[PDB]
Design a protein around this ligand. Structure first.
Ligand SMILES: CCCCCCCC/C=C\CCCCCCCC(=O)O[C@H](COC(=O)CCCCCCCCCCCCCCC)COP(=O)(O)OC[C@@H](O)CO
Ligand SMILES: CC(C)CCC[C@@H](C)[C@H]1CC[C@H]2[C@@H]3CC=C4C[C@@H](O)CC[C@]4(C)[C@H]3CC[C@]12C
Ligand SMILES: CCCCCCCCCCCCCCCC(=O)O
Ligand SMILES: [Cl-]
Lengths: 51, 33, 193
């Protein structure tokens, strides 16, 4: 907090954020495939190479 | 097998030091107004 | 000035993402590899044990390392402290992979918002890793670890066994997670400028 703001204002997001919920589908369309790809990568590499 | 841990510890701390040096380089670059 | 500022911010953001992937790789490596603590010259038997998996020796001029332990079977884990440490490391891994997902949100969501979201989750992952590495020492008093190392071993007492590369790598992961999270906090605040 060296910039000279409150701890919460420096840290958290109590300025706008909820409101932007209509874009949940747009977020999910790329969020969910990325999560599944990551899970597949870590699962398969752990169970095949490192395990 | 020679149950000694010198090379492994050395490379481990070397890689850790390199990563931390890059991180502090980024921090110093950000704090260089 | 503005073009240089924007280019520097983008470059540091890309570097921060690269080191975030590196920290996720470190978390996966330390969780999977069972090389937290290991034998020494004076140990009764050779071997090495991580969060849940352990491979003690047989004890007859031989290798004979019996690898038993699996996080998927909590019974095989020697100690409740080991169980808790594995759980906390897993939660930290879940959080950091959560950020490897949330990098996708940069397309649509506000850059400051996404940066803050991973700044907080990286802080939480660092806290979980600290808790795991602080509670893992409590488990050496268990009978299996006592047989592995010796009578000198105890709670927060190595005895004769020696920390191998995974434990110190975990410590580097903790402090790198902390500095990366702070970098994320300030980067998110810097987007608004
Ligand atoms: C092995 C592990 C593999 C894991 C896979 C990791 C990959 C995960 C999946 C997708 C990543 C998608 C990243 C997309 C980044 C593109 C970011 C971008 O679009 O450009 C701008 C800059 O953003 C930014 O500086 C943020 C920078 C993005 C940093 C995160 C991406 C990291 C990619 C590095 C990958 C290296 C892999 C190598 C590993 C060995 C933001 O746009 P914009 O102004 O219009 O928005 C403002 C708002 O008002 C509307 O969006
Ligand atoms: C949804 C996204 C953000 C996170 C996904 C986390 C994934 C990668 C996690 C969740 C549970 C994890 C598994 C939990 C238990 C074990 C058993 C252990 O002996 C090897 C690792 C392994 C097999 C883990 C691999 C990684 C894993 C599959
Ligand atoms: C699953 C997707 C969950 C999305 C969580 C909210 C993401 C960010 C929401 C936008 C907030 C903002 O205005 O910056
Ligand atoms: Cl397992």
């Amino acid at each position: 907090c060296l910039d000279g703001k409150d701890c919460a204002s420096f840290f958290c997001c109590f300025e706008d954020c909820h409101i932007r919920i209509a874009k949940m589908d747009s977020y999910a369309r790329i969020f969910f495939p990325t999560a599944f790809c990551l899970f597949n990568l870590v699962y398969w590499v752990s169970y095949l190479y490192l395990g | 097998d020679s149950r000694d841990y010198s090379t492994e510890l050395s490379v481990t701390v070397a890689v850790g030091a390199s990563l931390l040096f890059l991180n502090i380089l980024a921090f110093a670059a950000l704090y260089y107004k | 000035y503005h073009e240089h500022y924007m280019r520097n911010s983008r470059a540091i953001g890309v570097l921060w993402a690269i080191f975030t992937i590196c920290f996720a790789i470190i978390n996966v490596v330390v969780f999977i590899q069972p090389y937290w603590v290991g034998d020494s010259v004076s140990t009764p038997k050779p071997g090495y044990f991580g969060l849940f998996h352990y491979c003690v020796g047989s004890g007859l001029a031989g290798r004979e390392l019996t690898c038993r332990g699996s996080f998927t079977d909590f019974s095989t884990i020697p100690s409740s402290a080991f169980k808790a440490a594995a759980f906390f490391v897993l939660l930290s891994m879940v959080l950091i992979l959560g950020c490897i997902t949330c990098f996708s949100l940069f397309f649509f969501c506000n850059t400051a918002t996404v940066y803050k979201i991973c700044a907080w989750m990286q802080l939480l992952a660092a806290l979980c890793l600290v808790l795991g590495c602080m509670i893992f020492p409590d488990g050496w008093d268990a009978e299996t670890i006592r047989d592995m190392c010796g009578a000198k071993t105890g709670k927060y007492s190595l005895g004769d066994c020696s920390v191998r590369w995974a434990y110190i790598l975990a410590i580097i992961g903790i402090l790198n997670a902390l500095i990366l999270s702070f970098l994320a906090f300030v980067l998110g605040n810097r987007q608004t400028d």
